[PDB]
Amino acid sequence: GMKIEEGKLVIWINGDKGYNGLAEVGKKFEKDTGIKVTVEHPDKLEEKFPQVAATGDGPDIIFWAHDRFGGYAQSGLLAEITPDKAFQDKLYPFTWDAVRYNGKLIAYPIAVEALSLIYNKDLLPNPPKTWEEIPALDKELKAKGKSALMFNLQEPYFTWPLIAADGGYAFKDVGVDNAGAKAGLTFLVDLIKNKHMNADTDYSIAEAAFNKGETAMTINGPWAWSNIDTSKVNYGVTVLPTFKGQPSKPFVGVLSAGINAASPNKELAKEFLENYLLTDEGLEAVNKDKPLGAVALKSYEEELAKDPRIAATMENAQKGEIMPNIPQMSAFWYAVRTAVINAASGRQTVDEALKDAQTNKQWYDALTWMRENTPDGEKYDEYPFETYGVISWWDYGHWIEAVAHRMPIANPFQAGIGNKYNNVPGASSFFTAENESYAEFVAEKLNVKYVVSDIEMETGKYYAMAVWAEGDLPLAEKYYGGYFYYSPTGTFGYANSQWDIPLNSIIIPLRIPSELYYSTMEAKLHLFDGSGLSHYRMIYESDYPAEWKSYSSQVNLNNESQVLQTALYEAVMRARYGVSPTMGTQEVLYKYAYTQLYEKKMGIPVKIAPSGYVKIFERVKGAVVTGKVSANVTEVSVNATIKTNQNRTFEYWQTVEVKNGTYTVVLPYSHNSDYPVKPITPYHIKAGNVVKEITIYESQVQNGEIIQLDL
């Protein structure tokens, strides 16, 4: 006979939830009513729902974290639910707040999720009730080869519960730079300054430290429990510590069930949810498949609560903050993530970090509003003639694009900046290129023939290039190491971390680059003068930075000892006022640091000496020299002395692997170019005890011609 259209309830839930258990509840409903219930778990259902809600594929009921439902309700996709007072009284009242758009309920709460304090009972049978207790506890444990506490410091989801504690921050606003946030962030950074925690501690490091028994406590959620069980750590889960007497405030996620505005069976959906799912029997079926954690239903929660871990989840959740809807949470996350990381790393003071977090949040909130309140929403989200422009100062264009999803008139991205994370050729991806092959990819795409670098690009501005290349402030931190200092006993030293520096030291306020920096194109070009590169040659350099032009009148710039002595002298002189060295001195210290820390591994020679403020290089095919290797060796080296137009000399080196009896080296300098920077020695090509000297014509370099030369 005829087909049927209102005969079924279609339910969508994510694949990581107990859908088989939910289907058992569906089977009971079907047995009782004859209405068949189909539980589906489509991939990306939370993205598909707004598209298909009104179609034949649309589900009658959708299960998801409450923080998507605001958006759904905003588009009119969810029916107002109508539970009576008796039914509302069956759930914890705070859970209903997660699904109320005021007055109106738009979903049924099912379960709640929040962070707890997790502790090792064998190291710490009585966990601390306050954050204030943690440093003394760490002192005790450090004596025994352990630490008190390790958790993910990289993500505001994990750090905000402490930062929000004082004043009990709630989302709309006070806002994020309020005095309570300053107190909490200050306490957090103090734990780092005093070595109770480490600023680079992330999720994986904290989880490994805890599950291998190295730290007494961690902060994490129910998703982390499985790995702990596997580790056989004797662990407990409990209420988060208070700060200044006030509860830590973790974000709360409430898994919720909304009813499709377009469903022709809203009353049956209500019946399924209220009288089948939200019962002890119903929640148990789902929970037995995959654990719901703490549930919104009081009667069942009181059964689950005999697992102390679940009791702890609910207690922290009742003390926490319902997570704001995704777009608000995102604006908050963007702003605060950088603040904590900058404060924790010493890039900024707590005050200035939270100050910028707040102003950044103003911008992110404004752009989020623009995204939801100006036309052509869905055409911009897939990110032509019928577009419009948003005009603002050029400093803001990338935010306008990334946050508002609108087209800025003044746009950083398309000013030839490019990036590394998406492989878009541009200045940032060229200068931070981690090998020449990558640099050549970028250069060829852009038809680069000349490179101009100054000492600012080498030093202070490199940071900006890395931020753009990585598309993120924190990600740029991997380009940097620690600090030079003089101890109170006069001993010169290097520390990976400022906090490892002895008290009363004189610290040179110049962050030294990490190994990664020295391998990038900007370093290869400006710091190493192009040494090692096959496709670039220097053709001109300007005069020295003025301070070094001046020093040269009383120091020999070719004596590394005198140069270093002079550099350290200036650095200390300025360091007493907390001022960084002059640019040329920064370069000298970068070179010195390389020779002390990284040269043994990387093997490129560099003289500790200053150099031209501005350097021009030409990009060339390079002359190819290749031949058989008769000597019993695995490498071939080529070197030449280059002299610039300032009469400074440096060494060009390149070393290649012998590949089955042959070598191939690509050389960018010629010996008859009309440029004022030129090699003043032939190339010296060495394979063991075999040494051969060669000079190259400019036509060979320009046309990439091949030279046969056996060794």
Numbering used by the authors: -1 to 170, 180 to 366, 500 to 523, 541 to 868
What does the paper say about this structure?
The genome of the hyperthermophilic archaeon, Archaeoglobus fulgidus, encodes three AglB paralogous genes.
We connected MBP to the C-terminal globular domain of AfAglB-L, without a flexible linker sequence between them. In the final model, residues 171 to 180 in MBP were missing, as well as residues 524 to 540 in AfAglB-L. Interestingly, the C-terminal α-helix of MBP and the N-terminal α-helix of AfAglB-L were fused to form a long, continuous α-helical structure, which fixed the relative orientations of MBP and AfAglB-L in the crystal. We found that the Asn568-Pro-Phe-Gln-Ala-Gly573 segment in the AfAglB-L portion was the hinge loop region. The overall structure of the C-terminal domain of AfAglB-L consists of three structural units, called CC (central core), IS (insertion), and P1 (peripheral 1). The additional sequence forms three α-helices (αA, αB, and αC), which is unique among the six structures. By reference to the present AfAglB-L structure, we concluded that the kinked helix of AfAglB-L contained a four-residue insertion between the first and second signature residues, Glu613 and Lys618, respectively, of the variant type of DK motif.
